Design a binder for this molecule. Structure first.
Ligand code: HEC
Ligand code: HEC
Ligand code: HEC
Ligand SMILES: C[C@H](CCC(=O)O)[C@H]1CC[C@H]2[C@@H]3CC[C@@H]4C[C@H](O)CC[C@]4(C)[C@H]3C[C@H](O)[C@]12C
Length: 71
């Protein structure tokens, strides 16, 4: 399947799966969550543990605006 882009007004956000599968061997960080995670995602989650927050905790991955968002 293909990567997805989140259409943030300020600039597209690419989500590259290959890098994540390799770097986050604990698949259950994202997969087999109970219901509600598709409806639940948004800016708050993205800027918290949904994206940026995991990058901070794991000490790797983009944490600056322009590293995630790119027109
Ligand atoms: C969140 C940061 C994730 C982690 C960590 C892992 N996966 Fe993932 N997976 C995630 C998303 C948002 C998607 C769909 C969008 C996309 O870019 O693909 C997926 C998709 C998969 C798939 C389908 C892939 C394909 O057919 O190309 C598989 C088989 C899958 N995910 C498995 C998987 C495993 C085994 C992981 C740990 C090693 C893993 N994923 C990490 C989100 C996230
Ligand atoms: C942990 C549970 C993560 C979540 C949730 C998200 N990301 Fe992530 N990401 C994570 C790690 C440990 C890394 C480092 C991978 C590496 O090999 O450097 C990343 C990396 C990225 C990248 C850069 C990939 C690259 O090839 O350099 C991007 C663009 C990225 N992450 C974006 C991203 C987004 C948009 C997420 C939410 C939708 C997200 N990540 C979640 C760990 C985790
Ligand atoms: C990845 C790790 C990100 C970093 C670092 C920053 N942003 Fe972000 N942001 C990210 C995603 C995946 C999303 C989309 C949420 C969704 O609904 O799917 C966003 C969202 C925004 C928004 C709202 C966009 C909209 O509603 O259309 C804004 C205004 C925004 N982001 C700005 C922004 C700034 C200024 C940042 C640095 C301080 C920043 N983001 C970091 C992913 C990530
Ligand atoms: C559930 C995990 C981990 C974050 C958490 O613990 O909540 C998060 C990490 C990235 C999130 C995905 C990002 C791309 C998509 C954003 C959509 O708007 C909702 C569905 C998707 C596919 C999201 C589903 C889910 O919200 C995920 C996989």
């Amino acid at each position: 399947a293909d990567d997805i882009v989140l259409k943030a007004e300020n600039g597209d956000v690419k989500f590259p799966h290959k890098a994540h599968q390799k770097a986050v061997p604990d698949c259950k960080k994202c997969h087999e969550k109970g219901p509600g995670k598709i409806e639940g995602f948004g800016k708050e989650m993205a800027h918290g543990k949904g994206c940026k927050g995991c990058h901070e905790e794991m000490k790797k991955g983009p944490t600056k605006c322009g590293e995630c968002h790119k027109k």
